[PDB]
Amino acid sequence: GSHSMRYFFTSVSRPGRGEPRFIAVGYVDDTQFVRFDSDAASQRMEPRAPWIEQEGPEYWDGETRKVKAHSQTHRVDLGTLRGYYNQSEAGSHTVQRMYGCDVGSDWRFLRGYHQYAYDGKDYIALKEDLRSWTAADMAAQTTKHKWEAAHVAEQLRAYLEGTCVEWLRRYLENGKETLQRTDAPKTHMTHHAVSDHEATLRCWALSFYPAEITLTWQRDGEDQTQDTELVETRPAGDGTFQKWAAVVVPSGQEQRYTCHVQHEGLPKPLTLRWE
């Protein structure tokens, strides 16, 4: 399978007093492994997965220096954007940035990306070729022009195809016992009468990793999409994910209905049926 390394950055201006709140989180696939929060006491990049603690003091110093530099870029950008959008000093505004790189199953560079948003809307993004930019609006046309002229994409591409994937491969190896372990969903069905004549069948998928999953109900071997209640996939809090799908059926007809579970940790999809 492919693997990704992604960094997510949020900075929020504080118009009443002080500088923006800045939060950075790094992920390998669906595993958080570092964080920085300008409101925390340490003022350090901090570990959030055991395998990143294999890195020595030079890593924490270097990532702290860089993440503070990232914070200052976001702070200045909030000022720039307030000007571009002719906004007052009194409002709070947000920048969000996500960048990262993927390796394929061949452990080589697969893709890289860098997306930026202002006040929860697309602003500018690096195109798939890692050489050009997409601007969402006319303000972002200014950034596209300036980043073209300053060859911002060229240093970004160098990182995405080089250092980014090199360190992703490092992390995947160091953390292989978890990062490259799939946790197939533990699946079960529950049955809840809602009347003497109707019952809810709920199909549960628990403790799975990664988060990508498909749960579907069928009746007589064809899809039963319209009648399914499907909750959004949600974190268990221990690094795994949860999901369920439910259907209401006539009592005594439960055997017609099947729950189908697709997950990359399964060699073949699972089929569950209430006896």
């Binding site: 790094g26 860089k66 530099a69 200045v76 720039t80 954007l81 300053a150 911002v152 240093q155 360190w167």
Partner: peptide, 11 residues
């Protein structure tokens, strides 16, 4: 590992 340098929108 983070990007070594993060250019602003406008320097």
């Amino acid at each position: 590992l983070l990007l070594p340098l993060l250019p602003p929108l406008s320097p």
